[PDB]
Each structure stands twice: as structure tokens, then as C-alpha cells.
Amino acid sequence: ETTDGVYRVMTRRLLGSTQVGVGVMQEGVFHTMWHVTKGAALRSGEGRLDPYWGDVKQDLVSYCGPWKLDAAWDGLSEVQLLAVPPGERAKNIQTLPGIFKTKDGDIGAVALDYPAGTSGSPILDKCGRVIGLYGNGVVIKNGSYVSAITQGKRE
Amino acid sequence: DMYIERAGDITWEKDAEVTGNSPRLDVALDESGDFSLVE
Numbered sequence: 001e002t003t004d005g006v007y008r009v010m011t012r013r014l015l016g017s018t019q020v021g022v023g024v025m026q027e028g029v030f031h032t033m034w035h036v037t038k039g040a041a042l043r044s045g046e047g048r049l050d051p052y053w054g055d056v057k058q059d060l061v062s063y064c065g066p067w068k069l070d071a072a073w074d075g076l077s078e079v080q081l082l083a084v085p086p087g088e089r090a091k092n093i094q095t096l097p098g099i100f101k102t103k104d105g106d107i108g109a110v111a112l113d114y115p116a117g118t119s120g121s122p123i124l125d126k127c128g129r130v131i132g133l134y135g136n137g138v139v140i141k142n143g144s145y146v147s148a149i150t151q152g153k154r155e
Numbered sequence: 156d157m158y159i160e161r162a163g164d165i166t167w168e169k170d171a172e173v174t175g176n177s178p179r180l181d182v183a184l185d186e187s188g189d190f191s192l193v194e
């Protein structure tokens with residue numbers, strides 16, 4: 001299946017069927033976070049998806065082709081996390097992002113809490129465009145989770 | 156072996172559940188792609 005949309009990334013290596021992450025299918029390319037697949041091959045029915053591009057520091061990986069997602073958060077508007085949690089239905093959660101201030105620049109950050117298996121869930125702008133993926137961030141004093149809006153680069 | 160299953164369309168839902176705060180955090184990103192907090 002190469003239909004555009006959001007997909008669960010599953011494994012049968014552990015007890016039963018376990019959801020390790022999520023990814024986006026766009027323009028024939030599957031996009032997810034590196035920590036979900038570790039760059040390993042993926043299966044889609046009888047078909048095989050081989051990795052094309054990856055980077056541990058950006059924590060991103062693309063299958064079948066180069067990274068296609070290039071929309072960006074405008075730094076002002078609210079966004080939607082299309083959370084796809086393990087064993088539960090896809091769900092849009094609107095929020096206004098915060099900021100990760102780094103030595104190399106500021107990045108948007110969504111302060112929403114989901115299981116680690118939700119990694120790779122897309123973050124969308126008002127037009128439905130994918131401005132980045134959820135699943136790489138930090139744990140604050142509160143014990144809560146805050147993820148960066150991790151976006152790749154389209155060549 | 157890992158596999159994928161379709162979970163839905165990528166669309167904006169008008170009148171979705173609005174939650175979450177907007178924190179400004181000082182962070183660092185290491186060679187392993189792991190974020191950490193500074194102070």
C-alpha cells in the first residue's frame with residue numbers, strides 16, 4: 001500500500017503485535033523517525049520498503065525516496081498533532097507550540113503527552129500540510145513530555 | 156521484521172480537542188540526536 005496518509009509501524013519480534021512508532025506516506029515516500037526503525041527495512045503487505053536517507057542526529061529516515069516534507073511552523077499559529085497511539089484510533093489534538101532554544105537556533109515544540117509508541121505522528125498546519133514529526137524531545141521538571149517539531153529538508 | 160498499516164488521512168480537524176501549554180525551554184542536542192535541558 002502506497003496511499004498517502006498516516007501509518008502505524010508495528011513489530012512481531014516481541015509479545016503479540018507491538019506498535020513501535022508511526023510514519024507519513026507522501027508522494028510514494030514513507031517518512032518516520034530514526035529511533036522507531038533504526039534504519040531497518042519495512043514491510044507493507046507483500047511489498048518491501050528499503051531505507052533511502054537517514055540521519056541519527058536529525059532523528060529522521062525516509063523509505064523509497066528522498067524526504068518530501070518541507071512545510072514549516074510559522075511561529076505564530078496553532079497546529080494539530082495527529083496522534084496515532086498504540087491500540088487506539090487516530091486523533092487530532094490542537095495546541096499552540098512552545099520553543100526549544102538551541103545554540104544553532106529556535107525550533108517549535110509541542111507540549112503533549114503520549115506513549116513512546118506514538119513516535120513519528122505528524123504535526124500539521126491549518127492547511128493539513130506536515131510541518132514535522134512528534135517523538136524527539138525532553139522530559140521537564142513536571143515529569144511531563146515536550147517534543148520538538150522535527151522537520152527534514154526537501155532537496 | 157517491521158511492518159506498516161494505514162491509520163488514517165492527514166487532514167486538519169476543525170473543532171478538535173484544544174489542549175497543551177507553550178513552554179520556552181533552553182535545550183541542547185547531542186551527536187546521538189538526544190535532547191537535554193540546560194539549567
Ligand SMILES: N#C[C@H](Nc1ccc2c(c1)CNC2)c1cc(Cl)cc2[nH]ncc12
Binds near residue numbers: 114135136189
Ligand atoms: N521511543 C521514544 C521517544 N524517545 C526517543 C528514544 C530514542 C531516541 C530518540 C528519542 C532520539 N534519539 C534516539 C519518546 C517518544 C515519545 Cl512520543 C514520548 C517519550 N517519552 N520518553 C521518551 C519518548
